[PDB]
């Protein structure tokens, strides 16, 4: 359960980057968002096409294969009280996060 | 040099509550004093067209021809005559368009079908999907309403009606709606409401949400 | 001195799914020569009385105004007049009719109230109740169905609408259908359909169940 | 002029419990003293005036008086003979009425509805609805008695008595009480009081809250 | 999201409190939450609903072009700010959108 906190305080100027963890068995990521007290955190940007309607637009992903990274980016980063940040591999969402990430 | 007619679909009868007889142009070249005459079969001619379209990049110089009638003018199988006469098509133009009788009537069966677990576990957007099944007349118009007032056309994607293997009168269509997975978990409408003649109020409707999948998971008996 | 008119309600709209203009004057003379004109208010007579009744003036017409206009416009739209020359009158007496319009068209809400628990425990039938709050222009259309199979009109009655106390424009129906009561002990869809001009499109019905209070997760008895 | 002859109605002799036979004079203006003469079958009920007003918005009003018996006599079934003299009208002259016996008494049956869930969903307002069927002499009079003693009349509306689907000679009719959700919500009884000829001692309760539909037995709980 | 705008405070003053306005038609509503109960109850809506002790007090304004829906309270007897609760849709309780003490 690794907790890094980037905690970017640009708030609307700022634009966050977070460098999750990269399996590299092209399995499929996504960034999770801990939804309001539900537990089941709702995936912000994934290998899937799919972007959250909140942060779309503004959320970008972009790989690091020699690395062993994926960088997701909130340019706008716009205020919206940040939970656990979750980014994890695997088709079940909740169960496959491994790094939280607080915001 | 062939101008194409289409007769109304029962989807657009429902939509605008009236019929509506349409020629479009294909294939000429572009002009301006095209015109159209819209006529019932008994020989009166109805009301014609009104601002009529400009001329097509592509080569085939599409225009606008309206006939307005009611559902019922068009249900009394009033054909039309659709004539074109203009310089870039010499030749005058007659159309034949009815609606074919004889046909079979039956009750569409319109079934509700949620989410797969599967898809939920993504938590990505998850596909609720309206099956509407035995249905004759192959033609029907599903739409989506939460909240009471339908979505818009983007969000939902009915399929275009095919047979149905086991009975062949009958047919079948789809409809998926893409909706949120939160949006999904939070107890929602989610109606299906499926337009057909052979209803009996030609409009019927269902609904989903989590609560309806939920089965009882305890049968507490009390003996005394 | 003028022209009394029944125009179409919505609930004969819907039943007859057609319109038929009628000016069939309550309280008139009927002598002789009373010719109805179903003229529109472009002055095109149409159809006037088809299947006009007798000449009797029972101190109202005993012949009928009737025809059967086309709805879409052909009801709303605009207004038809009807001018009507008696063998006495050298002013033919006309009257045109907009349908009323100018109303405030709100949606009705329908709400299936399920029989009482005493009426239940009498065991001699049981009454459900479609209580329709709300709407805008007065003039609802409520049947009940089971199962797809519209009901006869035998074993429902519906009140006429009334006035809201709290909304001063907005009114109330009651629809109730009675059963039989070994009837509502097992499962019976008993769907209520409403058909108001204001609504989606224009039908929305909601069903009840036996089942349909109790709580789903879980099936507690008391066994004595 | 015009004589009119309104007999007492069964919620007036339960209101004010002395029957008040009623004339009334119409197509005439109002001199002085407007009244309208009173005898009974023997002549003795010679009754003073009321409701005085010096014209009508066309300067005709009709004149109005009042006359006074015991209550009984009027449901003992005997003619009543009121006479018709007045200043305007040219000749005076009487009338006679009485009420309409022969006539089935079958006994109210109430029930009382509490507003669906989805009413209370709304959390605007809630209809708790009074519904009394099987009574024919058509009258009926009921009121709304909450938290001891009555409540506005405005709040309450009941539907004029509609005679019943399978039993013929038996009516009904309706009774919605409006009110806020947060009373019902948290406790608070209204009865409703149906006061009819047919009933034992003329008055039937009836008392619904929101506890009533819940088993006092058992009581299970589901929690997360 | 909690962005409670508005706790001003007047004997006499009037309190604007922008809502979330989605334009799909659906019922929009000001509600208010009550201690006792746990459940938020209605003081405005679309349909013209109308609370006991606001009665004639507090009004609505619609701006589709800008997405807002206005309440307006116009005197307010510092009777207690609420947590108060947009939401859409024709279930009070479950549909709200943002919370405004
Ligand atoms: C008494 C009781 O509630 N228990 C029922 C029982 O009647 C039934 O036979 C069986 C399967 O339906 O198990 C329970 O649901
Ligand atoms: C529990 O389930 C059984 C299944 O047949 C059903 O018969 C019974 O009515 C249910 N219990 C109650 C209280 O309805
Ligand atoms: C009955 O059940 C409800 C369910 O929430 C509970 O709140 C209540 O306390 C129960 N009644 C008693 C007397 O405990």
């Known amino acids: 359960r690794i907790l890094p906190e980037v905690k970017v305080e640009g708030e609307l100027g700022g634009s966050v980057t977070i460098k999750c963890p990269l399996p590299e068995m092209h399995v499929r990521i996504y960034l999770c968002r801990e939804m309001a007290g539900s537990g089941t955190c709702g995936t912000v940007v994934s290998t899937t096409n799919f972007i959250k309607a909140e942060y779309k637009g503004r959320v970008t992903l972009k790989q690091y294969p020699r690395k062993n990274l994926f960088l997701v980016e909130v340019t706008q980063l716009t205020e919206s009280d940040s939970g656990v940040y979750a980014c994890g591999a695997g088709m079940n969402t909740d169960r496959g996060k491994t790094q939280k990430v607080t915001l | ?224």
Not at chain 2, 59 to 68: H, L
Request: charged share 20%.
């Open chain 2, 1 to 224: 040099i062939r101008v194409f007619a289409i007769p109304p679909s029962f989807a657009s009868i429902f939509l605008t509550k009236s019929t509506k007889l349409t020629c479009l142009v294909t294939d000429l070249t572009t002009y301006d004093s095209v015109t159209i005459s819209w006529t019932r079969q008994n020989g009166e001619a109805v009301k014609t067209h009104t601002n009529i379209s400009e001329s097509h990049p592509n080569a085939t110089f599409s225009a606008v021809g309206e006939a307005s009638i009611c559902e019922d003018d068009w249900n009394s199988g009033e054909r039309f005559t659709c004539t074109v006469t203009h310089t870039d098509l010499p030749s005058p133009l007659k159309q034949t368009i009815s609606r074919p009788k004889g046909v079979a009537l039956h009750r569409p069966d319109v079934y509700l079908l949620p989410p797969a677990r599967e898809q939920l576990n993504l938590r990505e957007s998850a596909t609720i999907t309206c099956l509407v099944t035995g249905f004759s007349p192959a033609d029907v118009f599903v739409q989506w309403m939460q909240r009471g007032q339908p979505l818009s056309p983007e969000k939902y994607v009915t399929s275009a009606p095919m047979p149905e293997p086991q009975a062949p009168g009958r047919y079948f269509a789809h409809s998926i709606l893409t909706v949120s997975e939160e949006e999904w978990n939070t107890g929602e409408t989610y109606t299906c409401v499926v337009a057909h003649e052979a209803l009996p109020n030609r409009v019927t409707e269902r609904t989903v949400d989590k609560s309806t999948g939920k089965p009882t998971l305890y049968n507490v008996s009390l003996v005394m």
